[PDB]
Amino acid sequence: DIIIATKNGKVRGMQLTVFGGTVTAFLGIPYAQPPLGRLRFKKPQSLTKWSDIWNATKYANSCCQNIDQSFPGFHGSEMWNPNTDLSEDCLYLNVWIPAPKPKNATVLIWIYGGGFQTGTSSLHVYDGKFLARVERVIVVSMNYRVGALGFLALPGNPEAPGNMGLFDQQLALQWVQKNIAAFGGNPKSVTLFGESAGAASVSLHLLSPGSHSLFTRAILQSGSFNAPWAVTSLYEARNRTLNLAKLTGCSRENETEIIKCLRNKDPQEILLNEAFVVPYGTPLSVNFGPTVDGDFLTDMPDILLELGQFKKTQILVGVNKDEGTAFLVYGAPGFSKDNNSIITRKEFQEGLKIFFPGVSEFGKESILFHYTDWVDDQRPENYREALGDVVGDYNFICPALEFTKKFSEWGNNAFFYYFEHRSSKLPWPEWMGVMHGYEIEFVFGLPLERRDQYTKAEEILSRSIVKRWANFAKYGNPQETQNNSTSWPVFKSTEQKYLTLNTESTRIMTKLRAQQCRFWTSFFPKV
Amino acid sequence: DIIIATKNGKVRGMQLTVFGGTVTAFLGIPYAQPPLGRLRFKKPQSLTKWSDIWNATKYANSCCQNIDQSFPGFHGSEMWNPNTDLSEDCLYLNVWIPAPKPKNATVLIWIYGGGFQTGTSSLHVYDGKFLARVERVIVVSMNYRVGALGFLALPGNPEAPGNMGLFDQQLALQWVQKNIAAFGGNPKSVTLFGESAGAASVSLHLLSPGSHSLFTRAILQSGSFNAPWAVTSLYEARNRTLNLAKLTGCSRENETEIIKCLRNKDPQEILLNEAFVVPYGTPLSVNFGPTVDGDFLTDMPDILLELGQFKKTQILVGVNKDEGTAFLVYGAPGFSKDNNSIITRKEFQEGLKIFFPGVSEFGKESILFHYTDWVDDQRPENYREALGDVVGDYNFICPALEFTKKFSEWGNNAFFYYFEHRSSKLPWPEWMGVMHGYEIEFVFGLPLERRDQYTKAEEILSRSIVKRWANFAKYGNPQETQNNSTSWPVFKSTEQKYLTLNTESTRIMTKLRAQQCRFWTSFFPKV
Numbered sequence A, B: 001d002i003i004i005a006t007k008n009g010k011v012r013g014m015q016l017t018v019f020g021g022t023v024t025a026f027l028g029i030p031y032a033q034p035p036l037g038r039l040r041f042k043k044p045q046s047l048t049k050w051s052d053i054w055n056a057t058k059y060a061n062s063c064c065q066n067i068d069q070s071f072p073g074f075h076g077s078e079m080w081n082p083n084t085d086l087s088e089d090c091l092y093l094n095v096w097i098p099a100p101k102p103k104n105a106t107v108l109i110w111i112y113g114g115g116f117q118t119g120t121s122s123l124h125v126y127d128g129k130f131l132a133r134v135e136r137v138i139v140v141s142m143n144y145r146v147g148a149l150g151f152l153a154l155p156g157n158p159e160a161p162g163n164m165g166l167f168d169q170q171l172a173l174q175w176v177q178k179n180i181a182a183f184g185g186n187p188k189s190v191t192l193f194g195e196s197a198g199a200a201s202v203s204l205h206l207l208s209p210g211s212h213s214l215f216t217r218a219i220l221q222s223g224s225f226n227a228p229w230a231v232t233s234l235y236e237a238r239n240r241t242l243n244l245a246k247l248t249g250c251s252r253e254n255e256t257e258i259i260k261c262l263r264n265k266d267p268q269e270i271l272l273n274e275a276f277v278v279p280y281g282t283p284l285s286v287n288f289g290p291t292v293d294g295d296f297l298t299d300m301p302d303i304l305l306e307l308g309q310f311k312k313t314q315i316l317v318g319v320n321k322d323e324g325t326a327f328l329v330y331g332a333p334g335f336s337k338d339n340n341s342i343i344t345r346k347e348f349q350e351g352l353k354i355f356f357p358g359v360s361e362f363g364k365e366s367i368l369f370h371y372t373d374w375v376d377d378q379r380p381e382n383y384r385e386a387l388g389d390v391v392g393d394y395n396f397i398c399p400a401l402e403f404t405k406k407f408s409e410w411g412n413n414a415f416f417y418y419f420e421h422r423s424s425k426l427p428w429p430e431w432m433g434v435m436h437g438y439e440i441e442f443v444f445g446l447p448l449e450r451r452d453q454y455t456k457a458e459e460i461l462s463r464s465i466v467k468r469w470a471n472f473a474k475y476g477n478p479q480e481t482q483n484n485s486t487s488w489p490v491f492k493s494t495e496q497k498y499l500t501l502n503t504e505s506t507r508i509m510t511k512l513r514a515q516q517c518r519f520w521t522s523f524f525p526k527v
Ligand SMILES: *[C@@H]1O[C@H](CO[C@H]2O[C@@H](C)[C@@H](O)[C@@H](O)[C@@H]2O)[C@@H](O[C@@H]2O[C@H](CO)[C@@H](O)[C@H](O)[C@H]2NC(C)=O)[C@H](O)[C@H]1NC(C)=O
Pocket: A239, A243, A244, A246, A247, A276, A277, A278, A279
């Protein structure tokens, strides 16, 4: 029976047999006052503190959010939907510790992605007990507010200042600073890690001064704040806050009145209108995201990046080989998970309309021009592959590569990887390739579980990834030093070396997507 | 009607329509006195010279040689068998010129391979009219003596000095020096090119002082003289010459007597005994090859290489991705072109006995040890792939890579490629992959012929290869400069960069076969 006392009270955990060993899980420890009522839309507040013993023996509620109902009964999509009740009262974190209680363990803190509109730390692919069993690190993850309830902004106004969910992430990192040594953790060795919006989040904590002393290093999976979906301009943010006001009949004249009104609507009604705060939208819409609030984020982050203002420490950044594929079956004419989606040229053109809504005609032709001159005009899946590349390179790959270059230029070691293994168990079709989100399970160690139908080659890839990640976290270098592994070079502006992750040989290459990111990065931002 | 006058007489050629254009072929021009009778086994002699007009309107005889009868009726193998009568009277070359007659063309001279035991310049895959049509270079190729009749040695004795066929190659390069300007050629711009034994040959002309001024630059396809099959030690050479003497009842006491005897045997009888001049032999045997004769080759070539004694000029070297596969179906138990050859561990071990005949037991285990510890023990074709790699890396890849490093260390630009396209028309089975010999057709331009059932992607690959090769030859740099092509770095000792050739994207990589050539190159030579 395992009780540990925290600044805020006592908590009891639960024992778990993992790979003939034991890990102790403390699931659902709260970490702020629930943000209800007068608290809805505001920065998270001090956890007040309990006598008695909190039982942290189940996952807690997920924050309120819309669910994906595009493919009901389909594991591919439904594995991302929340798997505990939704509730405004959702500010809880989990801790996983090795048994016996370690003495001064390195801490991995996961930030889930979800477009800032969705996600929960209790997904199966985010289970921290393999890491803690196998590398005897500690693993912490947090639920943070998503959608309007976490990122609604009316700037300057503390009733709705913006970035609420980013400060919930922040107050969780404070909670580990204050409390983790009690579970055996080293607060001086914390690595943040995250995927997609959770990676974007990690990147902004690197820019945020209030985070600067709550962690040591950073991992960025398929995401960084300079991605085009990751930050909302102050313009659009008020437009959206007021479009929301409109839609819930809350338009007012006093702005503390709009908020006061909005703080009365039921959850379902805010959720139900989020999708429409915006005229055209796309499968990659982020209607309520991070903003420059003068508080968490003191200036446009692209400026802060360029001018070297951010935490100086090492970063590990990566992307998957087919990032863009997963979003095509949510709206691009011709695309299906249930056939092979050979689309035509005219369909590709229509696709650009779905993905690049407004979006000058010359903008769109220039993408066509870049992506459709091939070698050669023969192959039927030419147009199908090109549209996935537009979307991967634009939305994820080129921005992760430019973050890493700008970041490495100021001095610190960075490592870049290029993940290209397709999971033997992937439920989406072949044509969709090495999809977005599908490294997560390798990073968390799921394939180490033999009982589970992954290949030998996959267990091996996983065991090695897990060791590189845990070496980065403790040592700032992601090598696997024992099993004659390919050495992972640092990424520099100049040679731009990266390491490829696959079940066969892993290689050192140079200048991923060189010709394509020259398009996205220098020319496109102009159209 | 196209006549051109040469130092030795006049010759008439023939016109050919190629790709809506015309090339002029002069096939079978003789280039030495036929080596018959008193000449058999001796260096080639001065072409004496004719009035009248030689018609060079057909390919001439191939030199005497054994044929491959392993797969009668099979195109895979039979495409390599000679396709004009065999005859001792076989010292002829072909010239292909663009029409209109160029003014000062660069000259490509092909040296065919064939293990030094076989081959002929009239194979279809060696047809020089695409190169001449498309790049308006001139292409010359020569028949040279192979097998005992070209490489029999009894050292010091001019009746059989060794290396006869290497001096036939040499006298052909002299013939181009003397005569090519008449066909429109620049004798100051000659590139030698060759595959397997023909590449080994090219490499030794780089070491041979008598060749040093008969050419400008060198191309090495799947071959170099430091390959383990490419040079015969003086020991084994006399053993073999006398074993041959024995076997044809010619053992004598006077050595000019053994030769005088041997010069009486019919061709078929020498050919018929070549295979047995040697106790164990292997699918890669070279019973009669180059030797250090004190004439063409003044010292062990490994010493000459190490100590920087060789023509200083640029080299382009390459290997195919599955070099070793083709030789497994000639003797390795379990292997077949007609099934997928999943062999067992015990079969692999037996395979090493076939390929590494004598061959300490510890030698052989150490190869097993290097090549059979995998990731992981699951895949059934594990042993099948490993045996092809032993044979490729040992026989071709590691020695081509070490030639290029040693050569680049003295100052000159080198380029290395790694060919990894499997021909859509390959007649051998899939498991055999990107085989030895199967770049030749891309280099010669065969896929440019649309009429011929190659893919679009293949025509494109070919057109690009042809342009890189022709740029090397004229400019010493194999770039394709027009079509936004990946830039080919020079290979240096240090980064060891190479370019991959495939129908998709071509890449810059580093240190091909690093771990394997550390085995072949430092450790193995010791066993
Ligand atoms: C800022 O918001 C306005 C508001 O428009 C909207 O009203 C909201 C409640 C919501 O329902 C939304 O879907 C609706 O469009 C946007 O104005 C609209 O723009 C489009 C094209 O520009 C027109 O066809 C609409 O008729 C127009 N609506 C109104 C009522 O004016 C405005 O576009 C937006 N800014 C951006 C850049 O997206």
